[PDB]
Design a protein around this ligand. Structure first.
Ligand code: NAG
Lengths: 27, 248
């Protein structure tokens, strides 16, 4: 149920410093 | 990791460190996929040319770590291993095809803010995200230069076109591997290194916001690949073996 959702990021609606780079790459 | 940056606290809560017990030494990265299962590379446990053939009792894992050295009281957790499983078709002499292993913890680890499992890829995630140009993420405490980091390092790396992957090496690559890394042209040259081997190559699904482990960092020696991309075990292709080991 809970995999891949980080307690200190996704679960808190916070984003890490470089995940934008990953998501923007998905053309 | 070479040319990465400092990870934030809890940024990679599925990161696992594999150690030799005696003499104590960091061997390989690994990943937490449930409360009692850890995924790593087979070559991390079994590599005959270097007289490497570890049993459960030779090893330990540390989970929830951020600093390489500092003991992180009430945060980091240590576990012994109940059983090791190496893919029966792991090819250590030629091309490291099916470079994958599972390790069962002696006792389940408690999840926390700092310890949390990564998702295994499903078909839709594999089909849509594993494409040339798309970036994944590697984390580890491997070497820093072609020396060692104080905190967990992170780098993002683009998946490379398969014909380029094939031309980057003289050994026969298989569909069970993929390669990632920046072009020998301008830009960056972040990479995974020796020590980061066995760790996760993760991608975030824009569909459901979850992190999926798409690859396992395969072979590396130092931080020098001679400008060539690193190879990764294709986790989704090996998913039925993983399930067979974990279920029944
Ligand atoms: C690893 O060691 C065990 C005995 O501890 C042995 O059964 C096995 O053949 C070894 N694996 C090799 C040499 O690949």
């Amino acid at each position: 149920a809970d995999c891949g959702l980080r307690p200190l990021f996704e679960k808190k609606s916070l984003e890490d410093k470089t995940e934008r780079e990953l998501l923007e790459s998905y053309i | 990791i070479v040319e990465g940056s400092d990870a934030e606290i809890g940024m990679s809560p599925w990161q696992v460190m594999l150690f030799r017990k005696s003499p104590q030494e960091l061997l390989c990265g690994a990943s937490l996929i449930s409360d009692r299962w850890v995924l790593t590379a087979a070559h991390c446990l079994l590599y005959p040319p270097w007289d490497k053939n570890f049993t459960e009792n030779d090893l330990l894992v540390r989970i929830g770590k951020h600093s390489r050295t500092r003991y992180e009281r009430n945060i980091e957790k240590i576990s012994m291993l109940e059983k090791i499983y190496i893919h029966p078709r792991y090819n250590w002499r030629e091309n490291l095809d099916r470079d994958i292993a599972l390790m069962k913890l002696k006792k389940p680890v408690a999840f926390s803010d700092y310890i949390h499992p990564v998702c295994l890829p499903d078909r839709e995630t594999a089909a849509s995200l594993l494409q040339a140009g798309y970036k994944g993420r590697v984390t580890g405490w491997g070497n820093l230069k072609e020396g060692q980091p104080s905190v967990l390092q992170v780098v993002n790396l683009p998946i490379v076109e398969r014909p380029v992957c094939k031309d980057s090496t003289r050994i026969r690559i298989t569909d069970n591997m993929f390669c990632a890394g920046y072009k020998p042209d301008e830009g960056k040259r972040g990479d995974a290194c020796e020590g980061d081997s066995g760790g996760p190559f993760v991608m975030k699904s824009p569909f459901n916001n979850r992190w999926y482990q798409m690859g396992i960092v395969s072979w590396g020696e130092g931080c020098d690949r001679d400008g060539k991309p690193g190879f990764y075990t294709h986790v989704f292709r090996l998913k039925k073996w993983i399930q067979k080991v974990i279920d029944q």
